[PDB]
Design a protein around this motif. Structure first.
Motif, PDB file in Angstrom:
ATOM      1  N   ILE A   1     117.799  41.146 127.992  1.00  0.00           N
ATOM      2  CA  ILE A   1     119.061  41.782 128.363  1.00  0.00           C
ATOM      3  C   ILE A   1     120.106  40.734 128.728  1.00  0.00           C
ATOM      4  CG2 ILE A   1     120.151  43.236 130.108  1.00  0.00           C
ATOM      5  CD1 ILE A   1     117.234  44.704 130.019  1.00  0.00           C
ATOM      6  N   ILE A   2     119.684  39.644 129.374  1.00  0.00           N
ATOM      7  CA  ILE A   2     120.614  38.578 129.737  1.00  0.00           C
ATOM      8  C   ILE A   2     121.297  37.985 128.510  1.00  0.00           C
ATOM      9  CG2 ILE A   2     120.746  36.261 130.744  1.00  0.00           C
ATOM     10  CD1 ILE A   2     120.365  39.094 132.496  1.00  0.00           C
ATOM     11  N   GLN A   3     120.631  38.001 127.352  1.00  0.00           N
ATOM     12  CA  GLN A   3     121.244  37.482 126.134  1.00  0.00           C
ATOM     13  C   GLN A   3     122.516  38.237 125.777  1.00  0.00           C
ATOM     14  OE1 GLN A   3     119.835  34.637 125.137  1.00  0.00           O
ATOM     15  NE2 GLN A   3     118.512  35.115 126.883  1.00  0.00           N
ATOM     16  N   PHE A   4     122.510  39.560 125.918  1.00  0.00           N
ATOM     17  CA  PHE A   4     123.720  40.340 125.700  1.00  0.00           C
ATOM     18  C   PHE A   4     124.759  39.997 126.759  1.00  0.00           C
ATOM     19  CE2 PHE A   4     122.088  43.135 122.445  1.00  0.00           C
ATOM     20  CZ  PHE A   4     120.729  43.095 122.654  1.00  0.00           C
ATOM     21  N   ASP A   5     126.005  39.816 126.322  1.00  0.00           N
ATOM     22  CA  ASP A   5     127.037  39.338 127.235  1.00  0.00           C
ATOM     23  C   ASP A   5     127.427  40.406 128.251  1.00  0.00           C
ATOM     24  OD1 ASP A   5     128.800  37.475 128.285  1.00  0.00           O
ATOM     25  OD2 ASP A   5     129.562  36.891 126.312  1.00  0.00           O
ATOM     26  N   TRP A   6     128.057  41.481 127.793  1.00  0.00           N
ATOM     27  CA  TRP A   6     128.478  42.560 128.684  1.00  0.00           C
ATOM     28  C   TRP A   6     127.419  43.660 128.727  1.00  0.00           C
ATOM     29  CZ3 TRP A   6     131.947  40.902 131.770  1.00  0.00           C
ATOM     30  CH2 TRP A   6     132.929  40.006 131.333  1.00  0.00           C
ATOM     31  N   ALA A   7     126.219  43.263 129.110  1.00  0.00           N
ATOM     32  CA  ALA A   7     125.130  44.214 129.226  1.00  0.00           C
ATOM     33  C   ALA A   7     125.327  45.101 130.451  1.00  0.00           C
ATOM     34  CB  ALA A   7     123.796  43.485 129.325  1.00  0.00           C
TER      35      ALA A   7
ATOM     36  N   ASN B   1     120.897  35.738 142.297  1.00  0.00           N
ATOM     37  CA  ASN B   1     121.777  34.709 142.832  1.00  0.00           C
ATOM     38  C   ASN B   1     122.009  33.604 141.812  1.00  0.00           C
ATOM     39  OD1 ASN B   1     122.088  36.021 145.274  1.00  0.00           O
ATOM     40  ND2 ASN B   1     120.432  34.892 146.283  1.00  0.00           N
ATOM     41  N   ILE B   2     120.958  33.200 141.098  1.00  0.00           N
ATOM     42  CA  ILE B   2     121.094  32.107 140.141  1.00  0.00           C
ATOM     43  C   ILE B   2     121.959  32.526 138.955  1.00  0.00           C
ATOM     44  CG2 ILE B   2     119.810  30.667 138.522  1.00  0.00           C
ATOM     45  CD1 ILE B   2     117.513  30.975 140.836  1.00  0.00           C
ATOM     46  N   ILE B   3     121.848  33.785 138.522  1.00  0.00           N
ATOM     47  CA  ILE B   3     122.676  34.253 137.408  1.00  0.00           C
ATOM     48  C   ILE B   3     124.164  34.172 137.730  1.00  0.00           C
ATOM     49  CG2 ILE B   3     123.134  36.164 135.822  1.00  0.00           C
ATOM     50  CD1 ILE B   3     120.255  37.147 136.793  1.00  0.00           C
ATOM     51  N   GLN B   4     124.544  34.301 139.005  1.00  0.00           N
ATOM     52  CA  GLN B   4     125.954  34.219 139.370  1.00  0.00           C
ATOM     53  C   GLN B   4     126.570  32.895 138.940  1.00  0.00           C
ATOM     54  OE1 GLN B   4     127.125  37.140 140.423  1.00  0.00           O
ATOM     55  NE2 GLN B   4     124.966  37.692 140.170  1.00  0.00           N
TER      56      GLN B   4
ATOM     57  N   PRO C   1     112.487  29.920 129.113  1.00  0.00           N
ATOM     58  CA  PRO C   1     113.780  29.730 129.787  1.00  0.00           C
ATOM     59  C   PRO C   1     114.413  31.066 130.141  1.00  0.00           C
ATOM     60  CG  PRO C   1     113.626  28.427 127.769  1.00  0.00           C
ATOM     61  CD  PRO C   1     112.507  29.411 127.735  1.00  0.00           C
ATOM     62  N   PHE C   2     114.738  31.238 131.422  1.00  0.00           N
ATOM     63  CA  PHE C   2     115.456  32.418 131.895  1.00  0.00           C
ATOM     64  C   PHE C   2     116.941  32.077 131.909  1.00  0.00           C
ATOM     65  CE2 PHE C   2     116.861  35.796 134.650  1.00  0.00           C
ATOM     66  CZ  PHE C   2     116.034  36.845 134.310  1.00  0.00           C
ATOM     67  N   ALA C   3     117.536  32.077 130.720  1.00  0.00           N
ATOM     68  CA  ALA C   3     118.931  31.698 130.570  1.00  0.00           C
ATOM     69  C   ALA C   3     119.515  32.412 129.361  1.00  0.00           C
ATOM     70  CB  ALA C   3     119.086  30.181 130.430  1.00  0.00           C
ATOM     71  N   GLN C   4     120.843  32.447 129.309  1.00  0.00           N
ATOM     72  CA  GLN C   4     121.563  33.053 128.197  1.00  0.00           C
ATOM     73  C   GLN C   4     121.777  31.987 127.132  1.00  0.00           C
ATOM     74  OE1 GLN C   4     124.658  35.733 128.965  1.00  0.00           O
ATOM     75  NE2 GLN C   4     125.808  35.323 127.082  1.00  0.00           N
ATOM     76  N   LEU C   5     121.065  32.112 126.016  1.00  0.00           N
ATOM     77  CA  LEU C   5     121.158  31.131 124.945  1.00  0.00           C
ATOM     78  C   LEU C   5     122.393  31.396 124.094  1.00  0.00           C
ATOM     79  CD1 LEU C   5     117.414  30.907 123.869  1.00  0.00           C
ATOM     80  CD2 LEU C   5     118.641  29.633 125.620  1.00  0.00           C
TER      81      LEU C   5
END
Lengths: 499, 501, 56, 56, 111
Positions: free
Chosen positions: B448-454, A447-450, A470-474
């Motif tokens: 995996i979250i680092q990759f954009d269109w994973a 849910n948070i990733i949305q 950190p659980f985030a996209q750097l």
């Protein structure tokens, strides 16, 4: 492929798919293998999309513990400005003038809150089922009550503005404008129709509470949380409680007259009236998105009624004593309190240096400053009085004008009848050993990733005794230090408290 | 407002920070609270960023089990074209010509693989330490061997191109062009300098192994996995094994000449030569990014030597016997194999319908059809022969020209000396009860979250006995059905195997 | 020499540092060795700068 | 309600909620609404005009 | 009055013809959801019509009560009685009626 160019009719008849699913409604993906029902709960056919997340903030003067604080400097400046154009009343101090001004800010925040509550309930769209009941639930009101008493709500907020017009506050100071803009807006994470809404809800207010000759003291005033069926009667009670010790005070009338004399009636802050044709509309704001992304939760406020083993007299009050600390305004709160008298091991993951994440490649100074307004890192643990220290409290190095306590997310339940769900959490989530805790945490994470610029998460596990970063996209990040954060917070608070 | 415009010098002095941290090394964030060292593992000061993700695919004819399959229709069309354009030897069939074309595609894939291996090793940038050692490790070679024997590697790849160019394959068939463009490029998830690289590595090749009067049979040929320090002698062995029964064969020369006369040299597909001055550059391609995002792993291939209790004779071969199915090309594999002879519980999560996620708001039919070429959903479980069914195999409803088997991610280690790490996984990840499995899974998810269109993830838990849906950020999505995907794959394969007329 | 002129972008990205620390506040330099916390007073992480001197 | 019935706003709200009781919460209805929104654009839909105190 | 589809008893009725036409139009621009029929789409549309009629009814009820003229003593109590409401209730809760009809329009804007 030339085949696509040669048979576009067959391509079109083969690629007929329904897009643009209205969010806020539970969807079932079905089974690709019809015989997979033997594995009943081993297959996830559910699909729920969250649509709103509320940032429970708190207005603060910004970490005053001596007379060199930006709050005290602004107090001295505003008192000098008022008293050097004042011929007459000399019975208050810079600190007293600043507690007024802070009470003015608190009631302005309350007016913005109720105005947003009123304006949200008129929002209905076919592409989003969350509008507006989910937002009203998150803010903590009763949507049925608002629907039944829209007229009463409108006239109540108008009367609130009119009664807030009795006192006077400077309009050059951007404290009020920033707080009202933050608390009176809806923000989408993307510029798309079925986007997710970001909201700011004041967790607390600053009931002024004058009693005794030992100065004034801004005692906490709690606010409704999500999932509370608060009605207009409750909100009127809250407003009357806020302004109970505010009217009838001759010293307050003297301060209001003096600031009216100093700043002309054109130069004061005025709450704009609202009517039936006023429409609030979600907007895309990259600055607020970035500062939400770089936000760190500090925990629930500490009240007098809150019991804390080994930490007595640690309430979140703005103490002003003329014989203590040379009469300086003192506000030194202790963070890490969640609401219960236990350790809350998840807060231990906040002890590492924060990572400031930014979009794009080139970052301006103003954008960087605005991107870390809600960031707050702990510095040292508060010393527990006594041999028992069941909770653990962390003293901050320095914070901005706002501190984030929790995050509230509203999403559709997976089970029947798929109603809204209440999810309150800090930046850190602790998951102990349980059958359903892990899957619940997985749903929380998905849910948070949305949300696009969601705050960075710090998961921790009770069995492994190990937290996570950190659980985030750097995208374009840097490591921030407590001293750099303190410098930026000092700059921001000094700029906000300017005339 | 005015205060910023009044003290801009102090604003700049306060907002000077070092950005653009070069990826490829372990970064320690330090401790904000100096007393946090007592809680040893309760504070995560580590920060590791993954830099490359490899898609282990497999070229396929596209789900043939009858003479009516699109591969058989294309075989008949191309054989008719060649035989009508040519006058002379009539000693092979449409099936023979089609397996010849498939073997030529396998040779081209292998040449592209080795050429990319050679060209990657010359990549270096100061902001990405994954170049090129991590990329070579993912491809499955020894970077020390490449740097020691660069000259031998160039000679070997040049000879491979020279010997593969002797035979002829049509350039109007976009099969070869698609495979070459897939296996001859590096793709970034974002158009930024410190982006993550997307790569394609063939898990299996299609050694011909022509023997017996019972037609031909394209047996699987394995390829080096990531973390294998395979050298030039191993690659030469692989090439010689691939072309052992293919070079110097009179019937093969006859077929290549016939294909030449059909499609003269202008219309033939050619391999670009490689030498010391060939540089490959990462490129941003939203189409390949989307079709990577909507890709579903099908599991490890099944070989003849691979033991399967209750599933005998399920090897991934392309059988062509004139006495069965009227001589049609037969290729119907069973998915759901991981490599060991057990249940592999994580594959149950793939029984749900896939979700096709696409960027933007309006999607053209071109993008919709190109975004689901690697997608593959199971339809029915394959029946187990006998009373013991330790593995579970799922029969696909129909797949495209490529099937993705595994995913490989290379990232730095948190511990000293922070070397590269190998992480092989399908779209579904299973975690049992263990002290380190949960934190390892969180590390995997954060990487995996680092990759954009994973690709979308399907996690399952051992004590929960419960899977989870697509672990991805949905933007504009639709729920795909088996019938729609089968129609899409039929159209895609038919468009793939096209011949001019 | 030529390498600096050949990768100046990475040179700049590596040599971006915050200077001009405002004096008047206590600065903590942190620990380069994380295991140095055992030696409590044997590591001087403090950094204080005087700002005025008065001649009586 | 028929003529000569002293129906009030509470009764009318009850009637509306009864009408829309089995109308919201239906995923098939949400699917239909999404499909018709995709087919006919938001400009091409039927919109109920708002009313105020000065509407005669 | 009473809203009706118009005497359907087979598949050649105008209602069924319009159902087929609207389903074809929706599904030929739809790539995705295929789980309903022309008949289902038309029952939706009919429910939409019914609630639109309800909104018009309540809006007329609200707007009538503000009509007062010296030449007609029926205005507006007779009209309110005919529609079936309480004129005293409308006079006491004009604001509630206005906000209720506005909320009805807003909630009808979902579909």
């Amino acid at each position: 492929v030339a085949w696509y160019a040669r048979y576009p009719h067959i391509l079109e008849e083969a690629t007929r798919l329904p897009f643009a699913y209205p969010i806020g409604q539970y969807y079932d993906t079905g089974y690709s293998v019809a015989s997979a029902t033997e594995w009943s709960k081993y297959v996830d056919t559910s699909l729920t999309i969250p649509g709103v997340m509320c940032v429970n903030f708190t207005p603060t003067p910004g970490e005053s513990y001596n007379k060199n604080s930006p709050i005290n400097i602004a107090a001295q400046n505003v008192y000098t400005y008022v008293r050097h154009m004042n011929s007459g009343h000399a019975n208050y101090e810079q600190a007293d003038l600043m507690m007024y001004l802070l009470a003015m800010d608190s009631l302005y925040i309350f007016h913005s809150y109720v105005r947003k509550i009123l304006a949200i309930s008129k929002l209905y769209t076919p592409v989003n089922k969350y509008f507006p009941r989910a937002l009203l639930v998150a803010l903590g009101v009763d949507p049925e009550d608002v629907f039944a008493n829209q007229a009463q709500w409108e006239y109540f907020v108008n009367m609130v503005a009119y009664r807030a017009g009795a006192f006077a506050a400077p309009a050059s100071m951007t404290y009020y404008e920033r707080h009202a803009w933050m608390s009176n807006g809806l923000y989408v994470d993307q510029d798309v129709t079925r986007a997710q809404i970001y909201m700011f809800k004041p967790t607390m207010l600053w009931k002024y509470e004058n009693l005794g000759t030992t100065g004034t003291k801004l005692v906490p005033l709690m606010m409704p949380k999500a999932g509370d069926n608060r009605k207009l009667v409750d909100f009127q009670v809250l407003f009357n409680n806020l302004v109970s010790t505010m009217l009838g005070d001759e010293d307050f009338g003297i301060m209001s007259g003096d600031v009216f004399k100093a700043f002309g009636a054109d130069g004061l802050v005025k709450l704009l009236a609202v009517d039936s044709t006023t429409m609030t509309l979600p907007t895309y704001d990259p600055l607020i998105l970035a500062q939400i992304h770089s936000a760190r939760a500090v925990g629930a406020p500490i009240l007098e009624t809150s019991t804390l083993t080994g930490f007595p007299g640690r309430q979140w009050q703005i103490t002003q004593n003329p014989d203590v600390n040379n009469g300086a305004i003192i506000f030194h709160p202790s963070f890490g309190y969640d609401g219960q008298d236990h350790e809350e091991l998840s807060f231990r993951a906040m002890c590492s240096n924060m990572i400031l994440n930014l979009p794009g490649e080139a970052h301006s100074a103003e954008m960087i400053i605005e991107a870390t307004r809600l960031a707050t890192m702990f510095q040292v643990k508060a010393v527990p009085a006594g041999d028992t220290s069941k909770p653990v409290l962390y003293l901050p190095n320095g914070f901005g004008t706002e501190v984030v306590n929790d995050y509230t997310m509203i999403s559709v339940d997976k089970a029947t009848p798929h109603d809204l769900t209440i999810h309150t959490f800090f930046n850190n989530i602790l998951v102990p050993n349980a059958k359903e805790n892990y899957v619940a945490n997985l749903e929380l994470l998905n849910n948070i990733i949305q949300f696009d610029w969601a705050p960075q998460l710090y998961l921790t596990y009770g069995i492994a005794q190990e937290s996570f970063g950190p659980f985030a996209q750097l995208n374009d990040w840097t490591i921030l230090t407590g001293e750099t954060l303190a410098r930026m917070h000092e700059v921001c608070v000094t700029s906000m408290f300017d005339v």
